[PDB]
Amino acid sequence: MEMEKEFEQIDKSGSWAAIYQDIRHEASDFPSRVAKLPKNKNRNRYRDVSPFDHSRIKLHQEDNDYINASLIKMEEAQRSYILTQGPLPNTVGHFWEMVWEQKSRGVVMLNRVMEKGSLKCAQYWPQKEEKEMIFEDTNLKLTLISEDIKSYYTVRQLELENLTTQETREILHFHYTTWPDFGVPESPASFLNFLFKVRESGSLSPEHGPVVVHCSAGIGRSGTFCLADTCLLLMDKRKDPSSVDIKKVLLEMRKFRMGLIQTADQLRFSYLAVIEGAKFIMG
Numbered sequence: 001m002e003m004e005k006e007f008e009q010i011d012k013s014g015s016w017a018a019i020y021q022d023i024r025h026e027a028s029d030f031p032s033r034v035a036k037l038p039k040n041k042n043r044n045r046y047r048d049v050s051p052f053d054h055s056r057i058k059l060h061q062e063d064n065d066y067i068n069a070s071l072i073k074m075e076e077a078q079r080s081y082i083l084t085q086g087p088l089p090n091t092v093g094h095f096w097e098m099v100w101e102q103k104s105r106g107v108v109m110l111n112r113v114m115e116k117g118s119l120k121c122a123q124y125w126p127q128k129e130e131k132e133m134i135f136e137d138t139n140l141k142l143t144l145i146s147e148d149i150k151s152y153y154t155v156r157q158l159e160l161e162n163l164t165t166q167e168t169r170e171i172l173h174f175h176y177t178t179w180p181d182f183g184v185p186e187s188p189a190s191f192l193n194f195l196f197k198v199r200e201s202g203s204l205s206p207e208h209g210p211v212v213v214h215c216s217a218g219i220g221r222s223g224t225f226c227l228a229d230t231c232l233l234l235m236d237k238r239k240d241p242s243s244v245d246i247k248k249v250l251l252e253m254r255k256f257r258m259g260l261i262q263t264a265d266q267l268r269f270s271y272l273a274v275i276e277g278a279k280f281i282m283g
Ligand SMILES: Cc1nc(-c2ccc(C(=O)O)s2)cs1
Pocket: 001, 002, 003, 235, 236, 241, 242, 278, 279, 281, 282
């Protein structure tokens, strides 16, 4: 496994940060005029990244189409993903209008609501069956239908209504619940267990809209979920599977959203995720 020799090289030489900065240095910088404007400044989780203007998801409202989210389109792999900030209290309604307008089936959440003592997002889904949520500003109802609580994650069925017209759709919320406060998980096994369960739902498949995933600054794990999925997929696609170069794939994703993969631990972990996984894919 070549990636693996290069991986092991790197390990022995203590080069993560140095490879990491290199990618940072060659990354893509694109304008983000929209995020940065006065009116839409209440709409951004702070500290947070900015959606480039060429890639941003447009809301279908005629007065502020703004949301902190991006479309990542991977031509080779035939995968698209929407990456976004954990919603704020003032943007919960926005988040669900995006999910509706974009025909998504799944939402993936890679963090806890509260971490390291602070709120990392607003509690954006109903906690109980009997108590649904109404977002008057975007005219939408959200009802919890079922909950499946497992050892590392939890999966939920949701029913979202478009109150203007009466349509309803099922949305599945996949939540990874055991990403440690500090660092990265030792083994990627649960992480890969989790990615295939999402795959299995149909939420990443071309017959649905793009999967919405949330990455919130100081903690932007989602980059890894996408990076990992795209490489594995390409390994199943090409003739020469050893030609998949995660660095290159990463930079490619970076043309669409700034700063995906937040650290050298996270890059290392990304290699790990893939190597295993590939290995499991061999049997
Ligand atoms: C059939 C599959 N092959 C791979 C890989 C095979 C070999 C690799 C390598 O040696 O680098 S990656 C992943 S899934």
